[PDB]
Amino acid sequence: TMSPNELGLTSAQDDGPLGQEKPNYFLNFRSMNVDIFTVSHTKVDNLFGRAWFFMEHTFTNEGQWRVPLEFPKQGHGSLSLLFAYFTGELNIHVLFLSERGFLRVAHTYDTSNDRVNFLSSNGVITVPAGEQMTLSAPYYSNKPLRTVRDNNSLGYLMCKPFLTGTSTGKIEVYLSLRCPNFFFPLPAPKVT
Amino acid sequence: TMSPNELGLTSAQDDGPLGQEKPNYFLNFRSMNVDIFTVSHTKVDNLFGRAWFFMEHTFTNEGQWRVPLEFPKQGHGSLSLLFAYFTGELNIHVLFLSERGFLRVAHTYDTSNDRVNFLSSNGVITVPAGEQMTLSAPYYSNKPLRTVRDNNSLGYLMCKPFLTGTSTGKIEVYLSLRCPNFFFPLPAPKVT
Amino acid sequence: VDNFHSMAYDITTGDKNPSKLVRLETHEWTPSWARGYQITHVELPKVFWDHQDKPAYGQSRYFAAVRCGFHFQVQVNVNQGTAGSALVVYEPKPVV
Amino acid sequence: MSTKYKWTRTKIDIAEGPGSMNMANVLCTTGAQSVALVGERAFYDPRTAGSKSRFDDLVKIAQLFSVMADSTTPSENHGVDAKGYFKWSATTAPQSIVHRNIVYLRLFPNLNVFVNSYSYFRGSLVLRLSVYASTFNRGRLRMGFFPNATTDSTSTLDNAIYTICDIGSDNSFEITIPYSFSTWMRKTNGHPIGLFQIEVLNRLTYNSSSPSEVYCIVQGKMGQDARFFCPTGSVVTFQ
Amino acid sequence: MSTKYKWTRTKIDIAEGPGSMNMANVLCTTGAQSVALVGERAFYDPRTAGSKSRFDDLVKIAQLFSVMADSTTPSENHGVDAKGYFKWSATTAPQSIVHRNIVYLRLFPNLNVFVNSYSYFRGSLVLRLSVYASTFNRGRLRMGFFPNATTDSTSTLDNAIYTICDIGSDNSFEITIPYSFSTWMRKTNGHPIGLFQIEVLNRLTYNSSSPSEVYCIVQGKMGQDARFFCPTGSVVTFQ
RNA sequence: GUUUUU
RNA sequence: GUUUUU
RNA sequence: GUUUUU
RNA sequence: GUUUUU
């Protein structure tokens, strides 16, 4: 039968270990699970499998653009802030807004600035002007885990455009991840 | 044999329940079914599976465009007005008429305006300038059924364009639905 | 349970009482009225709690949500000499 | 081993109009991409609608009766108009007309919708005349129909598809028109369905306490063999 | 042999919006190209995180208690505010209120995150009141909850979902609210969850060496049947 | 690592 | 030449 | 006409 | 839900 513990009478100091799926009942109540869709939208793989805006850059010349990639404190991706460590594939969505040219894109977790001077070794997929690509950067991280908060939690992204004439433009960036491994959930964030 | 009831002699007050496929005959007449095509054009899935114009928007800048989506009182889609409730997939056809840029598109049934500020979480498929896409929005409705008439019977559509230069244009919209679930047919509409 | 049944009623009488059949409305059709004129109407479902004298009025007070089915019986009596016809129809919120 | 040929990605030719969007074929739209989080489907709830299943075919709606050219007031021209709401009188003589008009699908609320949706159709049409008299009133009324007729003029119905109505307990009378046209399918909004006439056969009798004239209603619906075919543009705008 | 037809590369029609990038469906993103040297996968190391496996479902986090409208100082308005940190007093009379406020998911740190992520949800909510008194203090306190209520006013809880708390060794009391809404799923950040009231049933008793008033904490979490559905935009920015 | 999907 | 991949 | 390839 | 199609 039902114990008084499952009826509401408990002790907060007896909750450890963390993660106790204890059932709560009353005479007219029972945990009822109802699913409205064929799958879950709470699973890390599904939720995060959907991109979210990151930032935009306007380029008037080929100069290279390197930006630290970090988890959002803004979109649905904020749900990541509930975790401390991450590891796994990283989907980067880049849009090249230009009239005539090409955009070199590359990703590295390496903090050294110089390693990115010769962009070709790193990757540098090519998005023709007016096209958008989605490259999935692997976990080539020199650190087993990525503190999820760091201003560079995610590796740096490189964008250099091979323009042809006076043409200029702007590069919008969106980020998403493939199968994410989060660990050791930390306390919920505050609001600004 | 044939009863006088099936020969025309009946009583209007004995029609309930609704939906009586009673056969009507005469000496030289019998219900003859002849099909001219390999399939039906009366089935809800087929008829509505074909789009119809909705509305057009001209944009001179990136400002976002949100428009309530509703059933037509104009095209063949008007046949929906014969029903009261709807539920199912929604096919949205968008044409981006622009010289150089990108068009963010997203759909939500959520009435709150703010939820749409950060468009990325919602969806935001990308149609490059001069391209047209057909996105099928699922029934992410907080209401089990959508009164078919409401000025927002269908969820709201969001369009924000990431233009690059002074370029401007117009976005034409067409709507269609995938497998529609209509219920409780109501009286026929009037004319203007 | 009173084994003598000093109250000869089904034990679940009080429970089912609120589902009991009740008079929701009455109106006098006026002969002059044109076709398509609305004779009378009843707010559904709040009409079953129309007055504090409605069997369902009691419980209806202690709950904010409701999910129910109806069984209407519109009655109209007229001598044989007279004739006419009325349209009794249910109109969901969408129609209304 | 196939190492005499360098390995390569498959090469394919792209047909004309790549990127063209087909908004005519359902087989095309249903295959469109999904903005769903996981390109998933939801569980529909018919119960909230009081139904056990969704509505799959529209033809069934076209098979639902609707008053013809319904009006607030009865025909003020002895029924010679399109109003399917006319009066039958003690005054009208036998062979006198109580109603006459050319019938079109658009004259019916339900059907008029399909008329503004589909371009063609086929099948039989059923009209049901409901005379509302008292239990004392008696008489007969013959309603005929000349399929495909256009001359709106009273004419003997001896050769037309008619139905004689003898007042009793079931005072609703039906008349079926089987599909009649040169073409296999016919314009939804084209040539008339035919001439509809309801002539008096036997004067409506009455007594001291019964009405000398009664009201009549004409409804119309599609037969069990009804079909609609091509969807076309709209000729009117609903509200 | 098929030598009556010249050999040809396959021809295919390209659907609308080729090159369009779908950033909504996961099934789309996971299939994106790989910039990996050999489009390879790495071996993850959970141990360094002290875990034996990664975290797969987020709902479990929504099922973790968090203080409601937590503050540094206890409710200075006799608990009539949103602060889930109030004081119970020897002074307060029975039926007097120690706390009252309208509850929203955003009032909880953990939940507020999901509120800013998902658009809808469903399931029961659990609130746990923890009164920290000494082993000598005794008394009762009834906390009720009117689901979906909006009028923030003290009212008899005899008809509300309540839980009577008798001080003892386990001074943490729970109360479950089963999902209650017209809709199957409900706005994450919409209509209130209901009216939460904690009234005094029996004055907190004490003695010469025990406190005349104690501190209380109210936590909130989702039930085992909790679910979230559509991810929506953000209504606030975290730090 | 069914950690694309069954 | 498993020297595309297993 | 293994005359795309084996 | 054969609720893409058979």
Cis? peptide before A17, omega within 30° of 0: yes
Q: Which residue is associated with the tokens 């994106």? A: E32
DSSP A62-85: ---EEEEE---SSSGGGGGGG-SE
Which positions ≥6 away from A112 have C-beta within 8 Å?
none
E63 touches chain A (CB under 8 A): yes
Report which residue type is found at D134: S
Torsion angles phi and psi, residue D102, rounded to 5 = -90, 130
CATH number of the domain located at residue range(s) D1-239 in this protein = 2.60.120.20
E28 touches chain D (CB under 8 A): yes
Q: Which residue is associated with the tokens 């850059």? A: A57
- Least Cα distance to D61 among D101, D103, D102, D117 occurs for D117
Q: For residues D226 and D221, give the distance between their C-alpha atoms in angstroms, rounded to a whole number.
A: 9
Torsion angles phi and psi, residue C19, rounded to 5 = -90, -5
Alpha carbon separation from A120 to A171, A185, D188, E35 (Å, rounded): 20, 37, 66, 12
Residue pair B134/D32 in contact (Cβ under 8 Å)? The answer is yes
A85-86 vs A146-147, strand pairing mode:
antiparallel
Which positions ≥6 away from E100 have C-beta within 8 Å?
E79, E80, E152, E153, E154, E195, E196, E197, E198
D54 touches strand G (CB under 7 A): no
Residue A10 corresponds to which tokens in the numbers above? 């408990």
Residue D70 corresponds to which tokens in the numbers above? 């319904």
Distance of CA D47 to the CA centre of its chain: 29
Q: Which domain holds residue B50?
A: 1-192
Would you put residue D47 in left (φ > 0), alpha (ψ -120 to 50) or beta?
Answer: alpha
B87 touches strand I (CB under 7 A): no
Q: For residues C64 and E214, give the distance between their C-alpha atoms in angstroms, rounded to a whole number.
A: 36
Query: What totals of helices (H) and strands (E) does chain A contain, helices first?
Result: 2, 11
SS3 track for chain D? CCCCCCCCCCCCEECCCCCCCCCCCHHHHCCCEECCCCCCCECCCCHHHCCCCCCCECHHHHCCCEECCCCCCCCCCCCCCCCCEEEEECCCCCCCEEEEEEECHHHCHHHHHHHCCECEEECCEEEEEEEECCCCCEEEEEEEEEECCCCCCCCCCCCCEEEEEECCCCCEEEEEECCCCCCCCEECCCCCCEEEEEEEEEEEECCCCCCCEEEEEEEEEECCCCEECCECCCCCCEC
User: Distance (Å) from the C-alpha of residue C80 to the closest C-alpha of chain E?
Assistant: 48
- Least Cα distance to E20 among B178, A77, A130 occurs for A130
Residue pair E33/A133 in contact (Cβ under 8 Å)? The answer is yes
- Least Cα distance to A34 among D45, D193, E136 occurs for D45
CB contact under 8 A, A191 and E236: yes
Instruction: Give residue numbers, 47 to 76 of D, with CB < 7 Å from strand I.
Output: 53-54
Query: Shortest CA–C1' contact from A49: which nucleotide?
Result: F4
Distance of CA E131 to the CA centre of its chain: 21
B117 touches chain E (CB under 8 A): yes
Would you put residue A162 in left (φ > 0), alpha (ψ -120 to 50) or beta?
Answer: beta
Residue D221 burial class via C-beta count within 10 angstroms: exposed 0-12, middle 13-18, buried 19 and up: buried
How many other C-beta atoms can be found within 10 angstroms of the C-beta atom of residue D124?
20
Residue pair B48/B180 in contact (Cβ under 8 Å)? The answer is yes
Domain ranges of chain D: 1-239
Chain C residue at shortest CA distance from D211: C82
Q: Which helix (H) or strand (E) covers residue B47, if one does?
A: helix B44-47
Query: Shortest CA–C1' contact from B89: which nucleotide?
Result: I3
Q: For residues A118 and E161, give the distance between their C-alpha atoms in angstroms, rounded to a whole number.
A: 67
User: Distance (Å) from the C-alpha of residue E147 to the closest C-alpha of chain C?
Assistant: 9
Residue D183 corresponds to which tokens in the numbers above? 């073409």
- Residues 132-191 on E with a CB inside 8 Å of C are 147-148, 159, 180, 182
Q: For residues C94 and B85, give the distance between their C-alpha atoms in angstroms, rounded to a whole number.
A: 9
Q: What's chain E's Rg over C-alpha atoms?
A: 27
Q: For residues B8 and D173, give the distance between their C-alpha atoms in angstroms, rounded to a whole number.
A: 6
Alpha carbon separation from A48 to A69, A143, A150, E52, E208 (Å, rounded): 15, 22, 18, 22, 58
B132-137 vs D33-34, strand pairing mode:
parallel
- Residues 33-72 on C with a CB inside 8 Å of D are 34-36
Q: For residues E228 and A108, give the distance between their C-alpha atoms in angstroms, rounded to a whole number.
A: 35
Residue E40 corresponds to which tokens in the numbers above? 């390879």
Q: For residues A100 and A89, give the distance between their C-alpha atoms in angstroms, rounded to a whole number.
A: 31
Query: Shortest CA–C1' contact from D53: which nucleotide?
Result: I1
What DSSP state is assigned to residue C6?
Answer: S
Q: For residues D117 and D108, give the distance between their C-alpha atoms in angstroms, rounded to a whole number.
A: 14
- Distance measured from the CA of protein residue D118 to the C1' of nucleotide I2, in angstroms: 27
Of A33, A85, A176, the CB nearest to E29: A176
Instruction: Give residue numbers, 3 to 62 of D, with CB < 7 Å from strand H.
Output: 4-5
User: Distance (Å) from the C-alpha of residue D231 to the closest C-alpha of chain C?
Assistant: 27
SS3 track for E114-145? HHCCECEEECCEEEEEEEECCCCCEEEEEEEE
Of E148, E159, E182, the CB nearest to C62: E159
- Least Cα distance to E127 among E90, E165, E94 occurs for E165
E3 touches strand H (CB under 7 A): yes
Q: For residues B115 and B126, give the distance between their C-alpha atoms in angstroms, rounded to a whole number.
A: 19
Minimum-distance residue to G4 (CA–C1'):
D7
Q: How would you label C48-77 residue by residue, b for 16+ Cβ within 10 Å and e otherwise? A: bbbeeebbbeeebeeeeeeeeeeeeeeeee
DSSP C12-76: THHHHGGGS----------TTPPTT-------TTGGGGSSTTSTTHHHHTT-S------------
Distance of CA D159 to the CA centre of its chain: 25
Residues listed for chain C: 96
* Number of compact structural domains in chain A: 1
CB contact under 8 A, E55 and A185: yes
Residue B86 corresponds to which tokens in the numbers above? 């709807």
Q: For residues B108 and B115, give the distance between their C-alpha atoms in angstroms, rounded to a whole number.
A: 9
Q: For residues D84 and D31, give the distance between their C-alpha atoms in angstroms, rounded to a whole number.
A: 46
Cis? peptide before C45, omega within 30° of 0: yes
Residue D114 corresponds to which tokens in the numbers above? 């399909």
Q: Which helix (H) or strand (E) covers residue E28, if one does?
A: helix E26-29
Q: Judge A/C contact: 3 or more CB pairs < 8 A.
A: no
Task: Please tell me what resolution, in angstroms, this structure has.
Answer: 3.1
Q: Which residue is associated with the tokens 């493939």? A: A178
User: Distance (Å) from the C-alpha of residue E25 to the closest C-alpha of chain D?
Assistant: 4
- Residues 84-113 on B with a CB inside 8 Å of E are 93, 106, 108, 110, 112
Sign of the torsion angle spanned by Cα atoms E137, E140, E141, E144: positive
Query: Shortest CA–C1' contact from D5: which nucleotide?
Result: H5
- Least Cα distance to B141 among D43, D53, A33, D26 occurs for D43
Alpha carbon separation from C71 to A169, C24, C25, C45 (Å, rounded): 68, 12, 14, 12
Q: For residues E104 and E119, give the distance between their C-alpha atoms in angstroms, rounded to a whole number.
A: 14
CA end-to-end span of chain E:
71
Residue A147 corresponds to which tokens in the numbers above? 């503190």
CB contact under 8 A, A172 and B164: no
Cis? peptide before B17, omega within 30° of 0: yes
Chain D residue at shortest CA distance from B45: D56
Report which residue type is found at E164: I
D188 touches chain B (CB under 8 A): no
* Percentages of chain B per state (helix, strand, coil), in multiples of 5: 15, 35, 50
Q: What's chain A's Rg over C-alpha atoms?
A: 22
Sign of the torsion angle spanned by Cα atoms A40, A44, A45, A47: positive
Residue pair A37/D40 in contact (Cβ under 8 Å)? The answer is yes
Q: For residues B109 and D72, give the distance between their C-alpha atoms in angstroms, rounded to a whole number.
A: 40
D37 touches chain E (CB under 8 A): yes
D contact test, residue of C32, C33, C35, C67 with most D CBs within 10 A: C35
Q: For residues E234 and E227, give the distance between their C-alpha atoms in angstroms, rounded to a whole number.
A: 19
B154-161 vs B88-97, strand pairing mode:
unpaired
Q: For residues E156 and E159, give the distance between their C-alpha atoms in angstroms, rounded to a whole number.
A: 7
Contacts of E17 in chain D (CB under 8 A): 19, 21
D1 touches strand G (CB under 7 A): yes
E9 touches strand H (CB under 7 A): no
Chain B residue at shortest CA distance from A57: B164
